[PDB]
């Protein structure tokens, strides 16, 4: 199938409470495989999936060097952005960065990403051309000028088209039994009366991987988008995910409703109804 690698960096200032915290986590699809936390007693890159443990000491040392450097650099960057927005030294602020590469089902580069945010708003992003930037405001335009002078885009393009894909393909091979295994959802429909003449049909999907899934209700074959309560897909804690979709139906009309489930793990898409 299609696969991606992402690193998620969070750098958070906390005036009066020491220097900014830097966190980095790395993912392949919905599977985290490393972390680094500058607040840890002894900050180092740590494995978070069994298949990465086989990487050698030089891998771990190199990762930790990079993340320690990031920790220092992001502290300067946070200072910089405070200034760009004429902000007081009193407030806490956050820079987030997420970057990485996407492969298609044939394993070749689909596209690269490098995106940053400040206090939860888009700040600056590498365009899909991996050559130019989109800056959100006049502050981000200052970052853009700096990054053009440092040839940052060119350096990211090299990483995204080169090492990013190489490593992702390596991880996909080393973790093939899990990373390249789609687990289909176990599904059922439950029925809960909500009154004398309405009941809740809840369509459940459990134990699936990856997290991407589509869960819909139809009445007489017609989508019930507005009437369906859809919870956010949630992690079970064993790598798998869970989701449900609920609809409130007139009592007696239950058989007019069908739950439809699409997932990569499914040999065939599912159509489910309540089975009294």
């Amino acid at each position: 199938g299609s696969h991606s690698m992402r690193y998620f960096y969070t750098a958070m200032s906390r005036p009066g409470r020491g220097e900014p915290r830097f966190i980095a986590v790395g993912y392949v699809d919905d599977t985290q495989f490393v972390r680094f936390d500058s607040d840890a007693a002894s900050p180092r890159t740590e494995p978070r999936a069994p298949w990465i443990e086989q990487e050698g000491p030089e891998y771990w040392d190199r990762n930790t060097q990079i993340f320690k450097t990031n920790t220092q650099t992001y502290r300067e960057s946070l200072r910089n952005l405070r200034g760009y927005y004429n902000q007081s030294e009193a407030g806490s602020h956050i820079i987030q960065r997420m970057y990485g590469c996407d492969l298609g089902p044939d394993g070749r580069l689909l596209r690269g990403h490098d995106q940053s945010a400040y206090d939860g708003k888009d700040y600056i992003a590498l365009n899909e051309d991996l050559s130019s930037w989109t800056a959100a405001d006049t502050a981000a335009q200052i970052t853009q000028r700096k990054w053009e002078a440092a040839r940052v885009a060119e350096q990211l393009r090299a990483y995204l088209e080169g090492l990013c894909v190489e490593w992702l393909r390596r991880y996909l091979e080393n973790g093939k039994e899990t990373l390249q295994r789609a687990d289909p959802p176990k599904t059922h429909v439950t029925h809960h009366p909500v009154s004398d003449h309405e009941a809740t049909l809840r369509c459940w999907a459990l134990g699936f991987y990856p997290a991407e899934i589509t869960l819909t209700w139809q009445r007489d074959g017609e989508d019930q988008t507005q009437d369906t309560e859809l919870v956010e897909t949630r992690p079970a804690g064993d790598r798998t995910f869970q989701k449900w979709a609920a609809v409130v139906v007139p009592s007696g009309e239950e058989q007019r409703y069908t739950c439809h489930v699409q997932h990569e793990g499914l040999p065939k898409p599912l159509t489910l109804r309540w089975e009294p």
Partner: peptide
């Protein structure tokens, strides 16, 4: 594996 030098550039 994370990118290195490119990220060492302050915002």
């Amino acid at each position: 594996h994370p990118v290195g030098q490119a990220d060492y550039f302050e915002y």
